[PDB]
Amino acid sequence: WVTEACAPQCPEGFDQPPVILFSMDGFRAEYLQTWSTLLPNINKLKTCGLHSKYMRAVYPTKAFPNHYTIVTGLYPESHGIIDNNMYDVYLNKNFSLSSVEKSNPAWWSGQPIWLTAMYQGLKAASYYWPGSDVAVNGSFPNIYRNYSNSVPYESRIATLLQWLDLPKAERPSFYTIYVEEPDSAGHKSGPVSAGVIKALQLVDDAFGMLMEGLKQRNLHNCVNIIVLADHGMDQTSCDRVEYMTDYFPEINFYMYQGPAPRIRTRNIPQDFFTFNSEEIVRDLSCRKSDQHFKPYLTPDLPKRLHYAKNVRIDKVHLMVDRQWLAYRNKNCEGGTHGYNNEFKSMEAIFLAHGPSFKEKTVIEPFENIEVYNLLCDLLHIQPAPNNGSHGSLNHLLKAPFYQPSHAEELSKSAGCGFTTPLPKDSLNCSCLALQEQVNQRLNLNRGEVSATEKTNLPFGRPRVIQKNKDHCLLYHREYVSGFGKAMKMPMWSSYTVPKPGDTSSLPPTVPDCLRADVRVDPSESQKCSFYLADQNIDHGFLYPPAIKGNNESQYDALITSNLVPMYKEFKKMWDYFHKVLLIKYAIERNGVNVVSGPIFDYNYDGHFDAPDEITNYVAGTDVPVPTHYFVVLTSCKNKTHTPDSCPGWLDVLPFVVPHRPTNVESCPENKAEDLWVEERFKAHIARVRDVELLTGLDFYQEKTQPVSEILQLKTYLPTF
Ligand SMILES: Nc1ncnc2c1ncn2[C@@H]1O[C@H](COP(=O)(O)OP(=O)(O)OP(=O)(O)OP(=O)(O)OC[C@H]2O[C@@H](n3cnc4c(N)ncnc43)[C@H](O)[C@@H]2O)[C@@H](O)[C@H]1O
Ligand SMILES: *[C@@H]1O[C@H](CO)[C@@H](O[C@@H]2O[C@H](CO)[C@@H](O)[C@H](O)[C@H]2NC(C)=O)[C@H](O)[C@H]1NC(C)=O
Ligand SMILES: *[C@@H]1O[C@H](CO)[C@@H](O[C@@H]2O[C@H](CO)[C@@H](O)[C@H](O)[C@H]2NC(C)=O)[C@H](O)[C@H]1NC(C)=O
Ligand SMILES: *[C@@H]1O[C@H](CO)[C@@H](O[C@@H]2O[C@H](CO)[C@@H](O)[C@H](O)[C@H]2NC(C)=O)[C@H](O)[C@H]1NC(C)=O
Ligand SMILES: *[C@@H]1O[C@H](CO)[C@@H](O)[C@H](O)[C@H]1NC(C)=O
Ligand SMILES: *[C@@H]1O[C@H](CO)[C@@H](O)[C@H](O)[C@H]1NC(C)=O
Ligand SMILES: [Ca+2]
Ligand SMILES: [Zn+2]
Ligand SMILES: [Zn+2]
């Protein structure tokens, strides 16, 4: 097989192609990029089959949360396996590999692919995989193996080939195989060592034995095989360890040490909830100038991680920097994983071979949450509810099983039509600069509406995937917004900033000028007096008035309908972004389409809040306070075209920045805004899908491109 050239070549009795999910623990993406030519079997798989540049793992980049994510399509917060070592307050039990609690089904939520196949007629076998030797939902796979780490790779392969030799009625359709290397070698001497080369060659021989075994049964061009990894590997040092003794006089708390630390009380279950979590994060925030960790309360963590909605996830969390560790007191010489999933070293491998997959294809990076839906498509079965966007992985398949469709709008735009240029209620807003006939600019004719629809909405208006959401669209010459009547603020604001000429002299925002929007009813509008009573929250502009047109154009944005509740400290970041950063991004991208708006996620479940879920409002008013603010930047991949006139692929840069009363996360004491604002926005980069879930809005529905291709853009995570 290894010396043979590149190839629906299924033998007698094989109607549907069998699926084999192969896991090579700790096989980082860099290992394939650098050492593929030293591994002849994996190199042939890389040459002949399909492979991604890398596969993104889930946070924390550990074995058990990641392996169970691959088979469920769920984030650790949903499937329950948040770590290998965890504690549940309600169960009052400790989960560990050395305990009998590993086999307890109470810890394992969701529906793994073996159960999904079993519940839909198909049979499933497993030769090691976390959860496979556990009775998840009261059921084990048809054939399984109780974990034993030292069983030779040849024996694991031989048993799998023996399972494929079984008669059609007994023979499983889905298979899982797991190997401990090159992870074990990665821990011992780091990712750049002779030990990892020996381990990479060992796993190549294992894969080679499987391919040669399949060739002997004439299944080498029949079986749909996926070769992947749970996470990557990075080098550690004992000179690169942060100690909690340097921040606390005495440690009275329990700490899950390493690259992804969690802090809780020692007195469990009695003090689990009463434990001052907010005190520990405050006691660790901005303590040292060159601090190699950042403390966080789980809802404050970047939204793209989706690591908060689970009782097993302790409120105190530490984000450790690259190649660093965080320990309780004074191993570390070698290598480890568990760090941020965006880190290059934490990136895993993904290779695919078989009749259903495209030949000699290099695909762009994707996330492990998407693998579950693909496994269902290969097995011709219906997936259980998961976090993967069904259809985003169709570009990997020759003939896609599932055809995705646009999300249907549950609420249509109504009202807010122009009637009279004079407002019925001033709403305690004042603009002494006027005299008021600038209100006629808001009265756009059919041609004027069509003109702003083409420029500011090139991919169409974001659809409202919310039932009974009373809203209206507001048209202006420089921007278009979707105003939410119940919350008295816009859900979204779309505008295409053209390529700027000179950075030297840019016009500022017109001060002390604010008026009522004549189109919006006073009862559904915000008042300027609402912000006088509140001392921590001030009014902010969603669309920046001075970004487009002249001084006359600014008046179209100096209205109550463009107002959003903002913390004085957050307003500093927001204003710096729209004044400096956004213009810089517009130069590089040859114009940029901006879609901004508020996010409400008080229960931190990653979904848009229901009115009853909002716990904070503007002092003595029903105007809700947003938890986060989204900024989705869309430009053309080909920089020769502007976002409003682009026929090809799009380039996206979404942000989900937390709306916090302090900027303690940035540690900005005596630091100018050019040193921390960009760093803070970049730290909160998310996918378009993340924004969609948090808002209940669906983007790019009017973009002339297949749904499967738009889903690739919606699941894309920009990396710098
Ligand atoms: N279904 C299943 N049921 C049960 N078990 C299953 C299983 N599937 C897989 N496993 C087991 O899972 C492991 C593979 O997972 P891993 O990829 O190693 O990661 P993990 O399980 O998420 O964390 P773990 O607790 O094991 O790592 P730790 O840092 O504490 O450290 C591990 C080792 O690395 C060393 N190490 C860690 N960090 C180091 C560093 N910075 N420098 C040097 N050595 C380091 C430690 O000394 C130690 O020897 C294997 O042990 C395997 O047998
Ligand atoms: C990830 O997918 C899961 C499953 O579809 C979502 O979790 C469900 O959420 C609903 C509503 O909150 C609950 O009633 C279910 O009990 C949850 N199921 C499980 C298995 O947890 C989850 O919200 C999705 N996450 C994101 C961020 O979209
Ligand atoms: C994995 O190990 C468990 C525990 O040793 C085995 O489960 C036992 O199986 C027998 C026969 O079905 C039952 O009578 C016992 O009650 C089970 N004990 C427990 C604690 O579950 C299981 O069969 C082993 N599986 C394999 C494939 O070896
Ligand atoms: C889970 O493991 C932790 C840590 O080993 C145990 O925590 C101890 O709990 C008692 C109170 O029950 C405290 O007085 C100790 O100080 C804790 N030890 C540490 C090291 O923090 C906990 O008891 C275990 N729970 C179960 C059910 O096994
Ligand atoms: C658990 O199994 C039952 C059938 O016994 C099924 O109805 C249910 O949907 C399963 N739940 C999960 C999460 O797999
Ligand atoms: C950009 O589009 C033009 C046609 O308008 C084409 O000639 C050019 O090759 C494209 N650039 C890239 C990088 O594909
Ligand atoms: Ca929510
Ligand atoms: Zn691992
Ligand atoms: Zn490991």
XYZ file of C-alpha atoms in Angstrom, residues 76-77 79-83 85-96 101 104-109 254 256 262 264 268-270 272-273 309-314:
41
model
C -17.328 20.689 27.112
C -19.886 22.919 28.978
C -21.381 17.386 27.221
C -20.155 17.741 30.853
C -16.554 16.530 30.387
C -14.862 19.880 31.121
C -11.587 18.197 32.321
C -10.037 15.942 36.908
C -13.279 17.711 37.957
C -15.866 18.063 40.772
C -19.705 18.199 40.614
C -21.321 19.888 43.677
C -24.791 18.254 43.142
C -23.379 14.709 42.704
C -20.708 15.433 45.421
C -18.213 13.150 43.602
C -14.715 13.654 42.120
C -14.085 12.648 38.495
C -10.603 11.156 37.754
C -16.218 7.621 38.881
C -20.321 6.845 36.111
C -22.834 7.832 33.346
C -23.954 10.927 35.385
C -20.827 12.832 34.152
C -21.407 12.041 30.425
C -24.079 14.220 28.728
C -8.186 24.438 45.948
C -6.437 22.651 39.443
C -9.572 26.646 38.010
C -12.581 26.831 44.124
C -16.937 21.312 49.405
C -20.002 21.034 49.053
C -20.717 23.420 52.022
C -18.966 25.899 46.915
C -21.415 28.781 46.169
C -22.332 27.212 31.358
C -21.594 24.156 33.621
C -21.429 23.812 37.449
C -18.187 21.726 37.006
C -16.536 24.877 35.505
C -15.422 26.863 38.614
